[PDB]
């Protein structure tokens, strides 16, 4: 009756030890997903901001090859400089005003964002 009480307490303990270890692994997985998710989103925010500044720059250019604006004036230049920086700051600044725009958020990275799939465990 005591050993009964004792060996019973032990099995219950070994259950608790098993269940909480499993749940601790599952909290590990979820932290990984939550973490890769913030990563992919940080990327998407990058590609997204770059495509928007290329466009701006290109806008400034197309307006120059039509003599609508002169990229050398004080004010119209300030503008050119702003988009120029962002492009240097975020693209492969190859020579002669050429740049290579690199996209960090791959295709599936964009599925992950768009598809909020989280394997959320419930104990």
């Amino acid at each position: 009756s005591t050993q009964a009480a004792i060996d019973q307490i032990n099995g219950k303990l070994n259950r608790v030890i098993e269940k909480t270890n499993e749940k601790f692994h599952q909290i590990e997985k979820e932290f990984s997903e939550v973490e890769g998710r913030i990563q992919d989103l940080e990327k998407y925010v990058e590609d997204t901001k770059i495509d928007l500044w290329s466009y701006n720059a290109e806008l400034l250019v197309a307006l120059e090859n039509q003599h609508t604006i002169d990229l050398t004036d004080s004010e119209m230049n300030k503008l050119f400089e702003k988009t120029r920086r962002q492009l240097r700051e975020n693209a492969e600044e190859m020579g002669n005003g050429c740049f290579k725009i690199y996209h960090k958020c791959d295709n599936a990275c964009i599925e992950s964002i768009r598809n909020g799939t989280y394997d959320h465990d419930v104990y």
Binding site: E58, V61, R84, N96, C98
Partner: peptide, 6 residues
Amino acid sequence: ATLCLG
């Protein structure tokens, strides 16, 4: 991608 401004 590429891009050449001025």
